[PDB]
Design a protein around this nucleic acid. Structure first.
Ligand SMILES: [Mg+2]
Lengths: 136, 52, 386
RNA sequence: GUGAACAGCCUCUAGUUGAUAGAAUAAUGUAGAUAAGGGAAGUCGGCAAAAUAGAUCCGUAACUUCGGGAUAAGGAUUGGC
RNA sequence: CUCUUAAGGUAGCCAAAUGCCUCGUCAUCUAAUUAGUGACGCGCAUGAAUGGAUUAACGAGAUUCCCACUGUCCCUAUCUA
RNA sequence: GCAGUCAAGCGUUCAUAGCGACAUUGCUUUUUGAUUCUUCGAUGUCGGCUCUUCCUAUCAUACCGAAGCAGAAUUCGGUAAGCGUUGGAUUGUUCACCCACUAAUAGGGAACGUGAGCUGGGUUUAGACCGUCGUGAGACAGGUUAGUUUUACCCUACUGAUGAAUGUUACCGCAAUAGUAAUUGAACUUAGUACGAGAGGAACAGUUCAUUCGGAUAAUUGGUUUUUGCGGCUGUCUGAUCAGGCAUUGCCGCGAAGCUACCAUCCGCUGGAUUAUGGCUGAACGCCUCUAAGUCAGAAUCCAUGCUAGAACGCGGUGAUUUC
């Protein structure tokens, strides 16, 4: 997760190390989200911090509105291509990785989301869920 | 507890089995195993696969 | 001059020496605290691990996102046919520790056990306990005296029991025999309960029950002589390392001019004794029962044995313990199943469980059907049959 | 024979079948492979490896000594009958 | 105008394979650059066949970055001789 | 580099909450000097990587004492090294610098730990280009580019593995000694509560998860494929067919089994005794005083429980013990 989130989040498999680029699912004007940090992440020598579903990450926009680039911003992960296993026994996975831009609290910068959203994420950030189409 | 069906082979999927895929739209797919999921990713057609 | 960055050492120094266990039946190095205010009963059970399968059940965990929801869990099924008493052993407190004072055996000792004293059974005269049985002839005396010896002295009483391995798919005829501490009231009641069971039979339902947390003692699957990488989880060296990279680079500083007991070295992996604790019981199956693997939700006649048999083991024709998660040891290996040394008042530990479904597809491949019935009902009729 | 081909791969005539051997398949090697998700975060440095690749048709920028650059880049096609 | 010692650095070019100070200043590229590039120049100590500046083409030369790529790495596993 | 004594002064008032000038006593041996004792019939010379262990002058984490401590936050100090102490952009760098996460991103040693462990980027041969210097040959901890990293099979140490002799052989055990392990964060709730003009704004109990570590495990998902298991493909060879050989496993799809992954799942015990400190009774001193005698509470500490080995010269209980 991150913080400013409502609730807890049973561990899901990590899909996105630092340096990963994922799609941006909102109307914000950004095409990419480039992962440079993960708000959960503890410490191990040589270990890459890596996010999963519903994690707040620090990002930059590598492509999109110039007024949105060259600066680091919070981001929330709504889809991952990396397989993970819900407690109900089912291994699942999306078609892409995507995040939505957000502020340190959780409030999305934009007000829309294209594509489906993992419920773990949606159940963790109200505003993401508020602005979400199909969930899961 | 529900049994699902392999959405490519029509096979029964009991709890824990195979994988679920969530395509771009929101079309959810199900495979009882890696074999039908490989065939699916290969853009095969179930109607032409004699055992489905 | 001080390691450049800090990281925790690789491996647990508590689990040394990483040698091969002195025996394949892992010792039980503690029993529960004896409460002499309650019935006499065994404190651990013998058994043979058969394999694993999957369960479905509703979780009862208030405040959890999966409270009142279905969850699937792995379970292991250890094959536990009833054990048989053939002796008691009395221990006396000394200032050098517990000591076995005497031991008395049963009049009649079965062939399964008898074999445990022979290396070459087939070409032997099987004279095992022949002269000792004669002690029973003098109406009492010899035996009675020693029972009395235990009652008089003896701070703790253990029973000698052994597995009926014949009731079990295993090729091994030789049976596994072990001591078990009697935890019911009074030293006297203990040896009496013991005497009243000679040659008789105790089964697991008189030892363990549903939702009971039990520990598991077994020798860990063997893997032979391991390199340092897998034995200790050591970082791999870069691809460009001359003469190998599955090593560790610095086996030590210049001083002490000795390799130290604490750095990682290649040698035996596996075959280690392990006492793994806190595995909740999910089923105490009955052997006669033809609905072993059935549920008050899934109401069909099926036995716990999956289609094709338990792989590398065979069928489950006896009572069984089904425990949550996994357990030290591989299939066919003798396992002691000891009950807890403490009263875990947890919440996880207190949760009463009801299974909703038990998996029973073939584990020998990507099993698609639960029963022969279901396979026929789905596939229709084939070129063979009818 | 395949094919542009004295290439690679298979063959005929001819010539070899000779380079101690047996039993196992630990570690660590040398040589040959593959890996879910991420994609150089590794490293002095993409070192090593991986990706491209024939042919037909289409298309092709700056710059230039006007000769080049140029297979630039970028596409579609390819069996059998 | 003057002195050393004959002249007194022109055309050009630069923190350049030549700049000490120096990780120079500004701009650019990055989340962040003792790196790269574009600029600036009282240049410790650039500079005109002791050749200076420009330069298409070529390079198993040195150097930066992008795309593709991938077990370099996260973080290891498995197989063959 | 680190720590003291004194107290002018700072601190609205007030030397000492937190500091502290002028002076002055020391400690350290990761600096750098000084020396030249050892090595010039040679102790591989930097940094990184990797791994272990130690020091405490403690950054985090436990429990405290103090404040210019209202709360929240912080700062000063004690017992404390039990346990952590990271991912990156630039540089060969050590060092430095910025981005970023974080409970915290503490400082040092172990031949400036660690080259028959790597790497070889820099320095440190011979090639070559510059600038400065020189008449020149050549020189310049100045810039630049290319420049071979050898041996273990011995002894010991360490990891694991057998094993003669204690009548024989077998089974079941004891436990001396040695090792030992867990870690840290958040959310819900307490609670918009205590406190506070306000702005703000905690904690214990309870509940749910997560991080770092460790030990197993393979039902599930995934990886791997000489199952050369099934099928598909190119080329050639067996007259065709069927069925096959060859192409260093010819190539492609699937592929059981085994092995195996925070890429998978399960599991990681609870008693006592103490430290700092706060106290009880209580003199010394007819008062006072936690201390002198006696005593209570009390920490990530320690000792047991628990976990691993089992002394091959520590032990106990038990079975059978030879006519060819
Ligand atoms: Mg020199």
């Amino acid at each position: 997760s991150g913080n400013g989130a409502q609730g807890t989040k049973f561990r899901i498999s990590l899909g996105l190390p630092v340096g990963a680029i994922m799609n941006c699912a909102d109307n914000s004007g950004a095409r990419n989200l480039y992962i440079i940090a993960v708000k959960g992440s503890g410490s191990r020598l040589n270990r890459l911090p890596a996010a999963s579903l519903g994690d707040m990450v620090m990002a930059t926009v590598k492509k999109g509105k110039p007024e949105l680039r060259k600066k680091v911003m919070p981001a929330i992960v709504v889809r991952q291509a990396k397989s993970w296993r819900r407690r109900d026994g089912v291994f699942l996975y999306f078609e892409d990785n995507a995040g939505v831009i957000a502020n340190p609290k959780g409030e999305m910068k934009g007000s829309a989301i294209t594509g489906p959203v993992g419920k773990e994420c949606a159940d963790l950030w109200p505003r993401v869920a508020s602005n979400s189409g199909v969930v899961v | 507890m529900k049994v699902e069906i392999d959405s490519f082979s029509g096979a029964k999927i009991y709890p824990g089995r195979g994988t679920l895929f969530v395509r771009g739209d929101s079309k959810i797919f199900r495979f009882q195993n890696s074999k039908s999921a490989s065939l699916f990713k290969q853009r095969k057609n179930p109607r032409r696969i004699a055992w489905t | 001059s001080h390691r450049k960055y800090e990281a925790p050492r690789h491996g647990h120094l508590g689990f040394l020496p990483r040698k091969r266990a002195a025996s394949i039946r892992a010792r039980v190095k503690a029993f529960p605290k004896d409460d002499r205010s309650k019935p006499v009963a065994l404190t651990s059970f013998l058994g043979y691990k058969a394999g694993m399968t999957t369960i479905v059940r509703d979780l009862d965990r208030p405040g959890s996102k999966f409270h009142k929801r279905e969850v699937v869990e792995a379970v292991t099924v250890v094959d536990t046919p009833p054990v048989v008493v053939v002796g008691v052993v009395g221990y006396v407190e000394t200032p050098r520790g517990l000591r076995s004072l005497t031991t008395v055996w049963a009049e009649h000792l079965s062939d399964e056990v008898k074999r445990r004293f022979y290396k070459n059974w087939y070409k032997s005269k099987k004279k095992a306990f022949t002269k000792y049985s004669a002690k029973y002839a003098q109406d009492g005396a010899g035996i009675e005296r020693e029972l009395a010896r235990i009652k008089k002295y003896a701070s703790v009483v253990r029973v000698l029991v052994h597995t009926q391995i014949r009731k079990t798919p295993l090729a091994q005829k030789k049976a596994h025999l072990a001591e078990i501490q009697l935890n019911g009231g009074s030293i006297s009641e203990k040896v009496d309960w013991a005497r009243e069971h000679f040659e008789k039979t105790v089964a697991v339902d008189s030892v363990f029950e549903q939702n009971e947390m039990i520990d598991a003692i077994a020798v860990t699957k063997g893997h032979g002589f391991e390199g340092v990488t897998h034995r200790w989880g050591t970082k791999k060296l870069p691809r460009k390392t001359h003469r190998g990279l599955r090593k560790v680079a610095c086996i030590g500083a210049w001083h002490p001019a000795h390799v130290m007991w604490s750095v990682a070295r290649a040698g035996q992996r596996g075959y280690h004794s392990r006492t793994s604790i806190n595995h909740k019981i999910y089923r105490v199956g009955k052997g006669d029962d033809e609905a072993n693997g059935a549920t008050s939700f899934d109401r069909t006649k099926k036995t716990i044995t999956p289609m094709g048999g338990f792989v590398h083991y065979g069928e489950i024709k006896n009572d069984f313990i089904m425990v949550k998660g996994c357990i030290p040891g591989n299939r066919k290996r003798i396992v002691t199943l000891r009950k807890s040394l403490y009263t875990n008042t947890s919440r996880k530990a207190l949760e009463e469980v009801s299974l909703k479904w038990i998996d029973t597809a073939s584990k020998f491949g990507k099993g698609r059907f639960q029963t022969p019935a279901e396979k026929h009902a789905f596939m229709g009729t084939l070129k063979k049959d009818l």
